[PDB]
């Protein structure tokens, strides 16, 4: 029910300082302590901070936690390559209650190359597929860094909720990242709107591609 909002992506060069915010409410963060976890690919989360700012044995002191009001923060002073990972805050909701509230999660990227905006290619449903009474919009996203994007679909100008399937970013052969998003529609939905748009937000900047049924 209650959500602890974290930024999806934070990045910095080796040796730089980054901070990860964790926004809650008076009921949870405002009334309870906060933990922070580090998760590397394919492994379980690892405790970094407990009791708001305590470090377990073996955690470098460049990881520092803080809390104020309804928000908590994890600071990493002097990013090292090994710090590239996902980070989760965790707190509780009531007084002396056991259910765990995990934050939405933050991907920390240690910048090993200049930031690169994604190249977006939006394909409409093919004639063969529409003949089969099916319709899929294919939004291909490539050559972006850091590997973190948010995809939003638009029917004309209205947002589209149902039918969206998006992959997690994966590193390409050229060491940039790629992702794909699919919007499943019926032939009627695809032809009852003048256009559909794939909006890809990367590092605060949006790249939009639009496709229309009429154009053959």
């Amino acid at each position: 029910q209650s959500v602890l909002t974290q930024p999806p992506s934070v990045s910095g060069a080796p040796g730089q300082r980054v901070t990860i915010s964790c926004s809650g409410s008076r009921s949870n963060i405002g009334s309870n302590t906060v933990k922070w976890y580090q998760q590397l690919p394919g492994t379980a989360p690892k405790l970094l901070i407990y009791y708001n700012d305590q470090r377990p044995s073996g955690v470098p002191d460049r990881f520092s936690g803080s809390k104020s009001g309804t928000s908590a923060s994890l600071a990493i002073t002097g990013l090292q390559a090994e710090d590239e990972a996902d980070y989760y805050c965790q707190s509780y909701d009531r007084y002396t209650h056991p259910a765990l509230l995990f934050g939405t999660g933050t991907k920390v990227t240690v910048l090993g190359q200049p930031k690169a905006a994604p190249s977006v290619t939006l394909f409409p449903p093919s004639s063969e597929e529409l003949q089969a009474n099916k319709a899929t919009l294919v939004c291909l996203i490539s050559d972006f860094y850091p590997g973190a994007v948010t995809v939003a679909w638009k029917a004309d100008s209205s947002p589209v909720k149902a039918g969206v399937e998006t992959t997690t970013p994966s590193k390409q052969s050229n060491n940039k990242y790629a992702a794909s998003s699919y919007l499943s529609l019926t032939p009627e939905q695809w032809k009852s709107h003048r256009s559909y748009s794939c909006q890809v937000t990367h590092e605060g900047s949006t790249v939009e591609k639009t496709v229309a049924p009429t154009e053959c």
């Binding site: 379980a44 056991p98 765990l100 093919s126 291909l140 399937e165 992959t167 154009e215 053959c216």
Partner: protein, 212 residues
């Protein structure tokens, strides 16, 4: 040496039951409350359930309440999660976690809830509309992998086969695109060669410019 080992995961169809186990050692299991925490592929952590040190009280997330049951046998130093009426949205790695300031996690056990069987892909052309991009859509297949080549392997420059998306239905879909010069769009012929060995499906689809 604290150690937590989850087991009981696997592949199951929706609506069926599964019982997870977490063998604990290296500490007084009976003195600690225990959590189950899950993580769907590519998603965040989601708390599932909690049980007191003595099993006197149990807590569940609304998404699993009434379907999952947490239990523990302190004489056996094992934690259990009985999962009934499983759904596709329960697909996740399920972790076992101790309750405390200095907590410990297990490696996790993967649970896949899907009614998907071997199925060959439906290949559709992604027609191009001085560099134009065209591809094929390899739609709805199971299981991995799928191999995609262009012109029987003669066309490798500018080819990008994207990783497949795992749909909620448990089926896969990927796309392969090639960036080619717009001038050769009328003369050159582009065929994507799709092969799905599990279903013995091999398809050669021709991608032609869209024309009314």
């Amino acid at each position: 040496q604290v150690q937590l080992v989850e087991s009981g995961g696997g592949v199951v169809q929706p609506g069926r039951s599964l019982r997870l186990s977490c063998a604990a050692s290296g500490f007084t299991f009976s003195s600690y409350g225990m959590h189950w925490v899950r993580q769907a592929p590519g998603k965040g952590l989601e708390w599932v359930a909690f049980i007191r040190y003595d099993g006197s009280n149990k807590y569940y997330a609304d998404s699993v309440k009434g379907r999952f049951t947490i239990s523990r046998d302190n004489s056996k130093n094992t934690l259990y999660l009985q999962m009934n009426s499983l759904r596709a949205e329960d697909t996740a790695v399920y972790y076992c976690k101790t309750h405390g300031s200095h907590d410990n996690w297990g490696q996790g056990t993967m649970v896949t809830v899907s009614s998907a069987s071997t199925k060959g892909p439906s290949v559709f052309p992604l027609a191009p509309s001085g560099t134009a991009a065209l591809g094929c859509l390899v739609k709805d297949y199971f299981p991995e992998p799928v191999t995609v080549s262009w012109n029987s392997g003669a066309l490798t420059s500018g080819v990008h086969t994207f990783p497949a998306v795992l749909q909620s239905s448990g089926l896969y879909s990927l796309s392969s695109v090639v960036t080619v010069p717009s001038s050769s769009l009328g003369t050159q012929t582009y065929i994507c060669n799709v092969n799905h060995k599990p279903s013995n499906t091999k398809v050669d689809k021709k991608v032609e410019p869209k024309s009314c």
